[PDB]
Write a protein that binds this DNA or RNA. Structure first.
Length: 294
RNA sequence: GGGG
């Protein structure tokens, strides 16, 4: 796959807070600094590949991040959070990186999810392809160790929503879907000031043939659950594990599950209507009836 | 900086 103005204030001398590179500073809000670092620090890593400059963020007034009620007091939303961006690199680096950021501020970095479903014989219900990605141990305090997810990752710099959903679908399942068969189904943005770095998420759906070859993760494959012990996990007290043993393929790390099961499994850590809120097809797709979410 |  094919992998208004920002006022930078040059620091004549670097503060010992970080100790012949140049150092530039940008004072802005989390509404904008969210996009220069991106969904998973990935847009920052890409600004690093393209220009070589390193980026670091820090709240300007972290003390306001501890108050509950509202220059002083609690922040109302995560977008009013004051953020200080520091750029480290050559002068041509900060220069080249400066416009890339000025094009990134106008984009909308998001996480993307492609709900892949298949029809069943003797059926009006459908099954969805499910993954279990094991999260890094350097993760915020509200993110569990293992995430039961549908295929999808995040957009790259300059990448549109649906192409990212198509790209990252193949990266985690080896399945190739055509753009004419992907339909947008919704978007969520639920963040709180303390999680000022959270980006929204765009949702899509598509139907694959019932006999489709599910190869599994094609990128970072050891970052997903596979080759588990069938009996060991069958006695786990977590209902998701007990569901993973019964349904998932240990060779690929993928499982086909009904929407009545997904919402039940996701109910503790998400709530009700998990599938219907995210993956309800639009009427023009002739898919609402076959999906069964209405 | 993981939309479970």
């Amino acid at each position: 796959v094919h992998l208004s103005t920002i006022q930078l204030e040059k620091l004549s001398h670097p503060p010992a807070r970080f100790d012949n590179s140049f150092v530039y500073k940008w004072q802005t809000k989390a509404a904008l600094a969210r996009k220069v670092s991106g969904p998973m620090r990935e847009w920052a890593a890409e600004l690093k590949y393209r220009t070589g400059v390193h980026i670091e963020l820090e709240p300007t007034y972290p003390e306001r991040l501890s108050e509950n009620a509202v220059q002083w007091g609690a922040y109302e939303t995560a977008d009013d959070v004051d953020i200080t961006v520091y750029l480290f690199g050559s002068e041509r680096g900060i220069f080249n990186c400066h416009k890339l950021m000025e094009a990134a501020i106008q984009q909308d970095p998001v996480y993307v999810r492609l709900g892949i479903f298949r029809r069943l014989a003797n059926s009006s219900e459908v099954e969805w392809l499910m993954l279990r990605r094991i999260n890094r141990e350097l993760r915020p305090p509200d993110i569990p160790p293992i995430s039961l997810k549908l295929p999808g990752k995040w957009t790259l710099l300059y990448e549109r929503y649906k192409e990212a959903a198509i790209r990252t679908l193949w990266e985690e399942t080896g399945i190739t879907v055509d753009a004419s068969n992907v339909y947008p189904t919704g978007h969520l943005y639920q963040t709180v000031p303390q999680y000022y770095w959270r980006v929204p998420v765009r949702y899509f759906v598509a139907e694959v043939p019932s006999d489709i070859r599910v190869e599994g993760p094609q990128v970072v494959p050891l970052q997903y659950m596979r080759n588990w012990d069938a009996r060991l996990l069958r006695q786990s007290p977590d209902p998701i594990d007990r569901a993973w043993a019964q349904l998932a393929d240990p060779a690929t790390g993928c499982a086909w599950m009904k929407a009545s099961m997904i919402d039940q499994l996701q109910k503790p850590l998400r709530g009700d209507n998990y599938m219907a809120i995210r993956y309800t097809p639009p009427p023009y797709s002739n898919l609402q009836e076959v999906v069964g979410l209405g």
